[PDB]
Ligand binder design. Structure first.
Ligand SMILES: CCCCCCCCO[C@@H]1O[C@H](CO)[C@@H](O)[C@H](O)[C@H]1O
Length: 159
């Protein structure tokens, strides 16, 4: 009965992962004081009041370059966290798309690789599994952009 899978999962203070159901769960949203949400869905959806949204129209296929949205998502999340908010990143199944964006974020703030990060995320959400293509994009991001972004965030929002 008690399995780590009852609503969005806390990934870090002020950061959560979820599916389309958690994204509409007012009880969950209130419980976790969610003030920001990143919706990674192919189509626009009615937005809940008192929440700041970031829409990322991307499908879950290994050919889709979600890496093109890493910078903006990480900046959105960071701003929200360092300013006392709570961000929920979600995708329909709560499996690969939202997971990819959050992994990229944690990689930049910790300086750790995507495998260790993904494995750490799985501990608190065993369904976590970005598609093969997103994992490669995570590979790139780790090598290239990760570190630069960390320094950038420090500049834009401070440490
Ligand atoms: C996870 C449970 C899925 C139950 C059947 C869902 C059928 C709709 O399918 C869903 O369409 C969405 C776009 O509209 C896609 O983003 C999702 O990946 C896709 O599963």
């Amino acid at each position: 009965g008690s399995h780590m899978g009852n609503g969005m999962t806390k990934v870090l203070p002020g950061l959560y992962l979820g599916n389309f159901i958690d994204a509409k769960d007012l009880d969950q949203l209130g419980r976790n004081k969610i003030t920001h949400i990143i919706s990674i869905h192919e189509s626009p959806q009615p937005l809940l009041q008192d929440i700041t949204y970031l829409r990322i129209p991307v499908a879950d296929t290994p050919e889709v370059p979600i890496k093109k949205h890493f910078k903006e998502c990480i900046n959105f999340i960071h701003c929200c966290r360092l300013n006392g908010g709570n961000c929920l990143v979600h995708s329909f199944a709560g499996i690969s798309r939202s997971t990819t964006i959050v992994t990229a974020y944690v990689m930049t703030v910790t300086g750790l690789g995507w495998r260790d990060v993904l494995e750490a995320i799985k501990a608190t959400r065993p369904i976590a599994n970005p598609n093969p293509g997103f994992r490669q994009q995570l590979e790139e991001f780790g090598w290239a952009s990760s570190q630069k972004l960390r320094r950038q965030l420090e500049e834009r929002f401070g440490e």
